[PDB]
């Protein structure tokens, strides 16, 4: 008979864990240890100390993460994005646009 007791102590006996393959150099949705986001994951030389899990830029925005399944310190670029603007001559003269 297998018994299970749950108290106020933190649970240290779990089972298998949530994860996927890790894709570099493409725009991707991601989660690292509960840090969710989306962007282009990339390699880095950023020297995280052994206890450090995440990295931040001057304006507090995340710029790097530890892969919990390897030694990899990734750098996270945001999604490539920008305003789209339409160049047009006046419609009275032509319908062409760029």
């Amino acid at each position: 008979v297998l018994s299970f007791e749950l108290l106020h102590a933190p649970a240290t006996v779990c089972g298998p864990k949530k994860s996927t393959n890790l894709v570099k150099n493409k725009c991707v949705n991601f989660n690292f240890n509960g840090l969710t986001g989306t962007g282009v994951l990339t390699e880095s030389n950023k020297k995280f100390l052994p206890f450090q899990q995440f990295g931040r830029d001057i304006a507090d925005t995340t710029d790097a993460v530890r892969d919990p399944q390897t030694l990899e310190i990734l750098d996270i670029t945001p999604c490539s994005f920008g305003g789209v603007s339409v160049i047009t001559p006046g419609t009275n003269t032509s319908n062409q646009v760029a």
Binding site: D57, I58, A59, T61, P78, F81
Partner: peptide, 22 residues
């Protein structure tokens, strides 16, 4: 202008040097 150089003057270069997320 200095033609050998962004073809700025000498004094324009000092001004462009002293003056110093997504």
């Amino acid at each position: 202008p200095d033609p050998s150089k962004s073809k700025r003057s000498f004094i324009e270069d000092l001004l462009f040097n002293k003056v110093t997320k997504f």
